[PDB]
Amino acid sequence: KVFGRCELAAAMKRHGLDNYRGYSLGNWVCAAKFESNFNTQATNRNTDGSTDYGILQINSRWWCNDGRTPGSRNLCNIPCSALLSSDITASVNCAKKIVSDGNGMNAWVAWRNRCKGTDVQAWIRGCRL
Numbered sequence: 001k002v003f004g005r006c007e008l009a010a011a012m013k014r015h016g017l018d019n020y021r022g023y024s025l026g027n028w029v030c031a032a033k034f035e036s037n038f039n040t041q042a043t044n045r046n047t048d049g050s051t052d053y054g055i056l057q058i059n060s061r062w063w064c065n066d067g068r069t070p071g072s073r074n075l076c077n078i079p080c081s082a083l084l085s086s087d088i089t090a091s092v093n094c095a096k097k098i099v100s101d102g103n104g105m106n107a108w109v110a111w112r113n114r115c116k117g118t119d120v121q122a123w124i125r126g127c128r129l
């Protein structure tokens with residue numbers, strides 16, 4: 001599924017991500033924009049052999065099982081394929097665990113490099129929310 005910007009904002013809010021761990025909704029929309037361009041089916045292979053999955057590019061080294069990441073964990077207790085669904089529930093629930101792991105949204109390097117310190121509210125501006 002490729003979400004629209006305001007569509008994704010609304011779905012994230014429906015699932016309780018708005019202001020989760022203190023991160024306003026625009027932070028989450030910005031992260032999704034640069035991780036996946038709002039495409040739930042996004043995947044990307046890392047040099048280490050892990051893979052990132054879904055709208056928030058959640059990595060198989062720690063967070064989900066794909067059967068092909070030696071030595072990895074599955075802390076969200078899900079197949080990585082669940083993170084590619086048109087329904088963002090699994091991605092949101094796993095992101096809540098990730099952002100609670102101590103480093104906040106710095107867990108997403110693209111958030112740190114492209115969203116942190118910017119006008120992230122622009123990502124939700126104009127949306128009926």
Ligand SMILES: [Cl-]
Pocket residue numbers: 003004005006007008
């Ligand atoms: Cl939209």
Ligand SMILES: [Cl-]
Pocket residue numbers: 005033
């Ligand atoms: Cl956009």
Ligand SMILES: [Cl-]
Pocket residue numbers: none
């Ligand atoms: Cl429901």
Ligand SMILES: [Cl-]
Pocket residue numbers: 018019023024025026
């Ligand atoms: Cl918010």
Ligand SMILES: [Cl-]
Pocket residue numbers: 024025026027120121122124
């Ligand atoms: Cl915001």
Ligand SMILES: [Cl-]
Pocket residue numbers: 039040041053054055056083084085088091
């Ligand atoms: Cl996703």
Ligand SMILES: [Cl-]
Pocket residue numbers: 059062107
């Ligand atoms: Cl990670």
Ligand SMILES: [Cl-]
Pocket residue numbers: 065074
């Ligand atoms: Cl497992």
Ligand SMILES: [Cl-]
Pocket residue numbers: 065066067
């Ligand atoms: Cl497996």
Ligand SMILES: [Cl-]
Pocket residue numbers: 065066067068069070071072
């Ligand atoms: Cl594995």
Ligand SMILES: [Cl-]
Pocket residue numbers: 068
């Ligand atoms: Cl493979």
Ligand SMILES: [Cl-]
Pocket residue numbers: 072073074075
């Ligand atoms: Cl595990």
Ligand SMILES: [Cl-]
Pocket residue numbers: 065066078079080
């Ligand atoms: Cl599994």
Ligand SMILES: [Cl-]
Pocket residue numbers: 011086087088089
């Ligand atoms: Cl959804």
Ligand SMILES: [Cl-]
Pocket residue numbers: 078089090091093094
């Ligand atoms: Cl879930």
Ligand SMILES: [Cl-]
Pocket residue numbers: 021022103104105
């Ligand atoms: Cl924080």
